[PDB]
Amino acid sequence: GSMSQFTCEEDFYFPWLLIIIFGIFGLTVMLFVFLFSKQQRIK
Amino acid sequence: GSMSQFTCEEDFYFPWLLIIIFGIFGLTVMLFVFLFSKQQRIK
Protein backbone atom coordinates (compact mmCIF):
# COMPACT_ATOMS: atom_id res chain seq x y z
CA GLY A 1 0.00 0.00 0.00
CA SER A 2 2.79 2.42 0.90
CA MET A 3 5.63 1.42 -1.42
CA SER A 4 5.54 -0.59 -4.65
CA GLN A 5 7.84 -3.59 -5.04
CA PHE A 6 7.73 -6.67 -7.27
CA THR A 7 9.52 -10.03 -7.28
CA CYS A 8 10.42 -12.67 -9.86
CA GLU A 9 8.59 -16.00 -9.67
CA GLU A 10 11.37 -17.99 -11.32
CA ASP A 11 13.77 -16.77 -8.64
CA PHE A 12 16.65 -17.62 -10.98
CA TYR A 13 15.72 -21.31 -10.94
CA PHE A 14 15.86 -22.40 -14.59
CA PRO A 15 19.17 -22.28 -16.50
CA TRP A 16 19.07 -18.63 -17.54
CA LEU A 17 22.86 -18.24 -17.68
CA LEU A 18 23.10 -20.95 -20.34
CA ILE A 19 20.64 -19.03 -22.52
CA ILE A 20 22.57 -15.78 -22.17
CA ILE A 21 25.87 -17.35 -23.19
CA PHE A 22 24.33 -19.01 -26.24
CA GLY A 23 22.52 -15.80 -27.14
CA ILE A 24 25.72 -13.78 -27.39
CA PHE A 25 27.36 -16.62 -29.32
CA GLY A 26 24.82 -16.50 -32.14
CA LEU A 27 24.75 -12.71 -32.25
CA THR A 28 28.55 -12.63 -32.31
CA VAL A 29 28.80 -15.27 -35.04
CA MET A 30 26.54 -13.34 -37.42
CA LEU A 31 27.86 -9.94 -36.33
CA PHE A 32 31.39 -11.16 -37.02
CA VAL A 33 30.64 -12.57 -40.47
CA PHE A 34 28.85 -9.35 -41.38
CA LEU A 35 31.72 -7.08 -40.34
CA PHE A 36 34.23 -9.50 -41.87
CA SER A 37 32.50 -9.36 -45.25
CA LYS A 38 32.50 -5.56 -45.15
CA GLN A 39 36.22 -5.55 -44.36
CA GLN A 40 36.93 -7.78 -47.35
CA ARG A 41 39.69 -9.65 -45.53
CA ILE A 42 40.54 -13.29 -46.27
CA LYS A 43 42.61 -13.67 -43.10
CA GLY B 1 -8.14 -30.41 -20.89
CA SER B 2 -5.57 -31.40 -18.28
CA MET B 3 -2.61 -31.89 -20.63
CA SER B 4 -1.53 -29.55 -23.43
CA GLN B 5 -0.13 -29.82 -26.96
CA PHE B 6 1.38 -27.55 -29.61
CA THR B 7 0.45 -27.61 -33.29
CA CYS B 8 0.93 -25.53 -36.44
CA GLU B 9 -2.79 -24.77 -36.72
CA GLU B 10 -2.54 -22.90 -33.41
CA ASP B 11 -0.30 -20.38 -35.17
CA PHE B 12 1.62 -19.17 -32.11
CA TYR B 13 5.32 -18.63 -31.43
CA PHE B 14 6.25 -20.44 -28.22
CA PRO B 15 9.25 -19.61 -26.01
CA TRP B 16 10.74 -23.11 -26.10
CA LEU B 17 10.72 -22.98 -29.90
CA LEU B 18 12.99 -19.93 -29.88
CA ILE B 19 15.52 -21.84 -27.78
CA ILE B 20 15.49 -24.84 -30.12
CA ILE B 21 16.12 -22.72 -33.22
CA PHE B 22 19.01 -20.88 -31.57
CA GLY B 23 20.42 -24.14 -30.24
CA ILE B 24 20.76 -25.68 -33.70
CA PHE B 25 22.21 -22.41 -35.00
CA GLY B 26 25.15 -22.48 -32.61
CA LEU B 27 25.76 -26.20 -33.05
CA THR B 28 25.63 -25.77 -36.83
CA VAL B 29 27.97 -22.77 -36.80
CA MET B 30 30.71 -24.64 -34.92
CA LEU B 31 30.00 -27.95 -36.65
CA PHE B 32 30.33 -26.19 -40.00
CA VAL B 33 33.60 -24.43 -39.20
CA PHE B 34 35.02 -27.71 -37.89
CA LEU B 35 34.13 -29.72 -41.00
CA PHE B 36 35.19 -26.82 -43.22
CA SER B 37 38.65 -26.71 -41.65
CA LYS B 38 39.02 -30.47 -42.09
CA GLN B 39 37.97 -30.21 -45.74
CA GLN B 40 40.80 -27.74 -46.36
CA ARG B 41 43.37 -29.24 -43.99
CA ILE B 42 43.55 -32.40 -46.10
CA LYS B 43 44.12 -32.19 -49.86
UniProtKB/Swiss-Prot annotation, chains A, B:
<comment type="similarity">
    <text>Belongs to the type I cytokine receptor family. Type 1 subfamily.</text>
</comment>
<protein>
    <recommendedName>
        <fullName>Growth hormone receptor</fullName>
    </recommendedName>
</protein>
<feature type="region of interest" description="Required for ADAM17-mediated proteolysis">
    <location>
        <begin position="9"/>
        <end position="11"/>
    </location>
</feature>
<comment type="function">
    <text>Receptor for pituitary gland growth hormone (GH1) involved in regulating postnatal body growth. On ligand binding, couples to the JAK2/STAT5 pathway.</text>
</comment>
<comment type="subunit">
    <text>On growth hormone (GH) binding, forms homodimers and binds JAK2 via a box 1-containing domain.</text>
</comment>
<feature type="transmembrane region" description="Helical">
    <location>
        <begin position="14"/>
        <end position="37"/>
    </location>
</feature>
